Design a protein around this ligand. Structure first.
Ligand SMILES: Cc1nn(C)cc1S(=O)(=O)NC(=O)c1ccc(-n2ccc(OCC(C)(C)C(F)(F)F)n2)nc1N1C[C@@H](C)CC1(C)C
Ligand SMILES: Nc1ncnc2c1ncn2[C@@H]1O[C@H](COP(=O)(O)OP(=O)(O)OP(=O)(O)O)[C@@H](O)[C@H]1O
Ligand SMILES: Nc1ncnc2c1ncn2[C@@H]1O[C@H](COP(=O)(O)OP(=O)(O)OP(=O)(O)O)[C@@H](O)[C@H]1O
Ligand SMILES: CC(C)CCC[C@@H](C)[C@H]1CC[C@H]2[C@@H]3CC=C4C[C@@H](O)CC[C@]4(C)[C@H]3CC[C@]12C
Ligand SMILES: [Mg+2]
Ligand SMILES: [Mg+2]
Length: 1141
């Protein structure tokens, strides 16, 4: 099936099997209908199985486990098999000046030997071109193919280890680091392997060339060699400098990215707090520090790169001078030694340093992967046969100076229900950890059963269909329909737009809090297990639905299976068989309930965004014309000037033009007065574009941001911005340098002889018409290839949030299969892109060769009795086109990189956003709310009024629009209608003033990784003594003094150290500093303890005594301080009065 394997030998050599896609993609848009199936050789299954079979031996049979050893047991003898052909193709390039140099000398009538035999040289030279064409490109493509296999084999091997990481390893560092570990060699590995052989080929080339140069310059060859040794040492020193600055700034990039992710995820809170300006400055300082090291690395890379161009004269003159002074040198050997040194400079100044740097990076990546592969593993050994009767006795455990649980025991017969209770932080969840084997007890003795179904408190939602999130692997209509219509999903499912096949994102951002709880609960009960562990599923569910689910699912469906339920509700305990209460990590009570009572134009915009890049580009052009003007006059002065060191004859004067073209690269090289300004100015363009994009995202309508993918926002700040910092500044410089040399060399030799320009027209046009044909298909495949990587990273992310559920039930093989399917999709697009690019770069050389054979035979045949003007003109023209072929291939990379610039620009063009509070009486009239444009209408024609200072209760069934109303107050979503506060209409004042009057307290409090004082007020409006004054009422004094630093402690990881109640207090104090008037609470009482619960009770009655509060609760017992009640149901709001109803 795979066209590569079905291809014949002759077609496979020329890459002819890429013909169908090039024609198909030239006249229409491509899709996943003609993307060819991947070859069987590089499927993820075959590569991973082979490599792991060699690696596991290396860590068990040999003394020292090294990944590099196992890698060479799989890919070494195929690596060397392509190295010999790569070497033989380079040797062919070194011996060309012998055949070509004699042909050029054959135009001189003063020669006899070359005239006698030129046809034989022409035939041999033609064969030399054909052999080299068909010897390099297959070898380079082979090395790319092996580099792809290494990348796939290691990524699949990494994922398998990730599924086995111990629980204690995950809690230190993961997810954010793990994804970054895979994004450093996504394309640098395969493409950065074809030049690893030049570490030994280049020394073999220098020895060969130095022997050939010894024939010309008897003993002065070494004088030029010593200059190249110094250049090699000089370039090597820059390598240590580049790596030092690269690895020194690695920690700054991670610091920016992790903070940027926090801002993106909680963007809805950032808008509500009116914190747009503060966050822009916070990132701005981080960019300013990073940019200092970025420029240093770019200056070092400039001097390392600009050594090939600035050595084309100092290596020739230094070796020709001693010989010319001792004895008179003729022009023919001056051109010949120039031709040899062109290859000599490329090998030692451009190929060898690149090869060495690659080995530093290839070995560094393998050692980084090697260390990760040997972390502590999750223990899979567990009891198999126990008759499904879990028992514990004298069990102790630690999460590290205090035991988490001590001497806890129970005994559950099959079909019983155990109710676990306690307080916040008592270890309810940690008790379930030991039962799954996630936390091996230090000195305990516990019995494990078979498959165990775990329902974590954290809601897990994975990409795909709603039913696909429930059924798992096997489907069953009768079972599915019963589970769906037992968890009260009947109504909500057949509501949205598409019944049940709705496609969800990672984490289910578009779903209600309680709807996600039911889906996670429904998945746990669907699958058959020996025992079920329900870790507090009723957190988000209101009382009315809580009873219905408890009576129809927990007590009805699984009435005859052992089940452990964690719950604090008093009524749920009496319906259980045995109860276990944890006081503080220790069993205070154990027993039954009965005994409990007693106890294009993109390029134009990229350049002019700075308005300073214009002047630098003009400066480079003006100097370029000055050097060209000098080159013209000096060649014209030598054109009429009348034995010296240089023996020049009338019949051999044409060598002047050949010599100039051979050294034109040096004469037109950009020095440090032009290169450094250009590199500096291109970098600050990236800084400018980042600022506009970061400014645009924080000031965009929420509806626009919801239409995009989950992780897509961060990907532009992670990949696209990073490309503008490293790849574009140097790739553009290299492209401009090559193009400028070609224009300069072709404009000076053509004015004296107005025929070279004409003879070189066909070559230029052929390279251009081929480029326009290939780019149509190449760009389309690149877009498909780049988009194919997001599903791969999403699978890795979602398989970590639900990792504890995976290992409990034993579904690792299923997720390994899913990960392999994601890789094969990315491999299919990448392989086709790599093959068509090889097709283009092979045909571009084949067009050059066919013109060379045409020129060579004409030049030899046209040469008559003397001279021959056609031979001189044509042969010189083809020497100019050698650089153009290089320049055309360099332009492909620039076009590929400008796709990233276009993606940056479209984010900037997003649309923008659209004592005054006397009493706080708002009036709502005809309010319609919708999350997305044209999706639905959650609330329709809402009308109600609030008395100033009243406490308004808010109730309703989960998934009705309870939280949509609170967001519509801030118009954080597309709304129509009029909401007036004390007579001031919804659109009489700017949006900034409107949002400042609301003290919203979300379910997830936004706390970024920064100083304690910075979180309270990023704008730095209030002094210490004013902050302490506010903390006196909210009870934050003792909370903050626990830490070593007062107002100076550095919170990390979302404030992980702070408990849920402590973050509620911090959010409450934040609204007091800004002096809010209308509060918006949203289900704070999920798992709160009375220690902090009573603090909010006082503050809403002491500081906000006269301020309106919208208490959003799920039970009437807590709502004993409200007068007015709002009830949401069937897209309607209806106000009420005192409890008598
Ligand atoms: C058709 C077709 N369309 N597509 C998309 C693929 C195919 S193809 O693969 O069938 N053929 C071509 O791709 C193809 C094959 C060979 C050549 N050659 C040009 C000089 C040359 O040298 C011959 C010589 C004997 C000297 C030696 F070989 F030694 F160099 N050969 N040119 C080819 N092309 C036809 C156009 C599509 C583009 C272009 C000009 C590059
Ligand atoms: N992964 C972990 N690493 C370190 N300490 C942990 C970890 N998980 C829990 N702990 C600690 O163990 C103790 C008990 O954890 P916790 O989940 O287990 O109890 P809980 O009663 O279930 O809490 P809650 O009802 O609020 O979820 C606490 O001191 C907590 O900080
Ligand atoms: N970001 C969103 N984009 C689109 N639709 C959404 C989004 N968030 C919620 N919805 C939809 O709005 C409806 C109600 O959402 P939800 O916040 O509003 O109800 P709720 O009563 O506040 O939830 P709960 O009581 O469980 O916390 C549901 O149909 C849900 O799918
Ligand atoms: C092993 C690899 C690197 C190839 C071989 C390298 C050495 C042995 C080769 C490369 C070029 C060769 C030289 C090329 C030209 C001449 C001039 C001739 O009048 C005497 C031999 C002499 C001086 C050759 C001696 C051997 C030589 C120096
Ligand atoms: Mg818990
Ligand atoms: Mg809600």
């Amino acid at each position: 099936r795979s066209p590569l394997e079905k291809a014949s030998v002759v077609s496979k050599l020329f890459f002819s099997w890429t013909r169908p896609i090039l024609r198909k993609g030239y006249r229409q848009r491509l899709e996943l209908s003609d993307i060819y199936q991947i070859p069987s050789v590089d499927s993820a299954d075959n590569l991973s199985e082979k490599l792991e079979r060699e690696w596991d031996r290396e860590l068990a049979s040999k003394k020292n486990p090294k990944l590099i050893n196992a890698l060479r047991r799989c890919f070494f003898w195929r690596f060397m098999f392509y190295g010999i052909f790569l070497y033989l193709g380079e040797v062919t390039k070194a011996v060309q000046p012998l055949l070509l140099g004699r042909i050029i000398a054959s135009y001189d009538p003063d020669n006899k030997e070359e005239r006698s035999i030129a046809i034989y040289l022409g035939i041999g030279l033609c064969l030399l071109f054909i052999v080299r064409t068909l010897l390099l490109h297959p070898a380079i493509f082979g090395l790319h193919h092996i580099g792809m296999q290494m990348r796939i084999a290691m990524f699949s091997l990494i994922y398998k280890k990730t599924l086995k990481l111990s629980s204690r390893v995950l809690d230190k560092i993961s997810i954010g680091q793990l994804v970054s570990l895979l994004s450093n060699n996504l394309n640098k590995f395969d493409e950065g392997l074809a030049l690893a052989h030049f570490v030994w080929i280049a020394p073999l080339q220098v020895a060969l060339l130095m022997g050939l140069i010894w024939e010309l310059l008897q003993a002065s060859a070494f004088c030029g060699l010593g200059f190249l040794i110094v250049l090699a040492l000089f370039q090597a020193g820059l390598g240590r400098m580049m790596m030092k600055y690269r690895d020194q700034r690695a920690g700054k990039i991670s610091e920016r990215l992790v903070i940027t992710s926090e801002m993106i995820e909680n963007i809805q809170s950032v808008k509500a707090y009116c914190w747009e300006e503060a966050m822009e400055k916070m990132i701005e300082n981080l960019r300013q520090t990073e940019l200092k090291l970025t420029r240093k690395a770019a200056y070092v890379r400039y001097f390392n790169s600009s050594a090939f161009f600035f050595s084309g004269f100092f290596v020739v003159f230094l070796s020709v001078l001693p010989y010319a002074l001792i004895k008179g040198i003729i022009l023919r050997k001056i051109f010949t030694t120039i031709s040899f040194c062109i290859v000599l400079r490329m090998a030692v100044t451009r190929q060898f340093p690149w090869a060495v740097q690659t080995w530093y990076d290839s070995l560094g990546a393998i050692n980084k992967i090697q260390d990760f592969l040997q972390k502590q593993e999750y223990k899979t050994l567990e009891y198999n046969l126990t008759t499904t009767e879990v028992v514990m006795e004298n069990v102790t455990a630690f999460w590290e100076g205090t035991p988490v649980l001590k001497d806890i025991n129970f005994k559950i017969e099959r079909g019983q229900l155990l109710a676990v209770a306690g307080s916040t932080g008592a270890g309810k969840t940690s008790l379930l950890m030991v039962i799954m084997g996630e936390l091996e007890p230090s000195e305990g003795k516990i019995k494990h059963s078979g498959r165990i179904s775990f329902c974590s408190q954290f809601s897990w939602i994975m990409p795909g269909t709603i039913k696909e999130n429930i059924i798992g692997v096997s489907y069953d209509e009768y079972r599915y329909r019963s589970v769906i219509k037992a968890c009260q999903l009947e109504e909500d499912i057949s509501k949205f737009a598409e019944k049940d096949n709705i496609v969800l994102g990672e984490g289910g951002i578009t779903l209600s809090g309680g709807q996600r709880a039911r889906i996670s609960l429904a998945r746990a009960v669907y699958k058959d297990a020996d025992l079920y562990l329900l870790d507090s599923p009723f957190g988000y569910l209101d009382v009315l639905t809580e009873k219905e689910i408890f009576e129809s699912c927990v007590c009805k469906l699984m009435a005859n299976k052992t089940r452990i339920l964690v719950t604090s509700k008093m009524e749920h305990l009496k319906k259980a068989d045995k109860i276990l209460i944890l006081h503080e990590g220790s069993s205070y009570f154990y027993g039954t309930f009965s005994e409990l009572q007693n106890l294009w134009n993109t390029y134009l915009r990229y350049i002019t965004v700075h308005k300073s890049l214009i002047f630098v580009l003009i400066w480079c052009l003006v100097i370029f014309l000055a050097e060209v003007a000098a080159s013209l006059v000096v060649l014209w002065l030598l054109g009429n000037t009348p034995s010296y060191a240089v023996i020049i004859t009338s019949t051999s004067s044409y060598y002047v033009f050949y010599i100039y073209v051979g050294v034109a690269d040096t004469l037109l090289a950009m020095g440090f007065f032009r290169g450094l300004p250009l590199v500096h100015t291109l970098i600050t363009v990236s800084k400018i574009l980042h600022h506009k994009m970061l400014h645009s995202v924080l000031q965009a309508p929420m509806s626009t941001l919801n239409t995009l993918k989950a992780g897509g926002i961060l990907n532009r700040f992670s990949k696209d911005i990073a490309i503008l910092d490293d790849l574009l500044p140097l790739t553009i410089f290299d492209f401009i340098q090559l193009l400028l040399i070609v224009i300069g060399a072709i404009a000076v030799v053509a004015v004296l002889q107005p025929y070279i320009f004409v003879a070189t027209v066909p070559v230029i046009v052929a390279f251009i018409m081929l480029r326009a044909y290939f780019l149509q298909t190449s760009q389309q495949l690149k877009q498909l290839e780049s988009e194919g990587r997001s599903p791969i990273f999403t699978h890795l992310v979602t398989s970590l949030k639900g990792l504890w559920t995976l290992r409990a039930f034993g579904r690792q093989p299923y997720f390994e299969t899913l990960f392999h399917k994601a890789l094969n999709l990315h491999t299919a697009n990448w392989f086709l892109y790599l093959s068509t690019l090889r097709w283009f770069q092979m045909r571009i050389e084949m067009i050059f060769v066919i013109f060379f054979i045409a020129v060579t035979f004409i030049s030899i045949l046209t040469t008559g009795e003397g001279e021959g003007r056609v031979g001189i003109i044509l042969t010189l023209a083809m020497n100019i086109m050698s650089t153009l072929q290089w320049a055309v291939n360099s332009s492909i990379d620039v076009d590929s990189l400008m796709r990233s610039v276009s993606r940056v620009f479209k984010f900037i063009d997003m649309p923008t956003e659209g004592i005054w509070p006397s009493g706080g009486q708002m009036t709502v009239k005809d309010l319609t709310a919708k999350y997305t444009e044209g999706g639905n209408a959650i609330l329709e024609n809402i009308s109600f009024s609030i008395s100033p200072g009243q406490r308004v209760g808010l109730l309703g069934r989960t998934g009705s629009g309870k939280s949509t109303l609170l967001s519509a107050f801030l118009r954080l979503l597309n709304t129509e209608g009029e909401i007036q506060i004390d007579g001031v209409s919804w659109d009489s004042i700017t949006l900034q003033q409107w949002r400042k009057a609301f003290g919203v307290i979300p379910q997830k409090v936004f706390i970024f990784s920064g100083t304690f004082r910075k979180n309270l007020d990023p704008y730095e409006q209030w002094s210490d003594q004013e902050i302490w004054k506010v903390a006196d009422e909210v009870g934050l004094r003792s909370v903050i003094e626990q830490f070593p630093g007062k107002l100076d402690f550095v919170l990390v990881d979302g404030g992980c150290v702070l408990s849920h109640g402590h973050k509620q207090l911090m959010c409450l104090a934040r609204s007091v500093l800004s002096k809010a008037k209308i509060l918006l609470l949203d289900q704070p009482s999920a798992h709160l303890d009375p220690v902090t619960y009573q603090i909010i009770r006082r503050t809403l009655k002491q500081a906000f005594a006269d301020c309106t509060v919208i208490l959003c609760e799920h039970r009437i017992e807590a709502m004993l301080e409200c007068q007015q009640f709002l009830v949401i149901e069937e897209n309607k709001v209806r106000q009420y009065d005192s409890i008598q109803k």
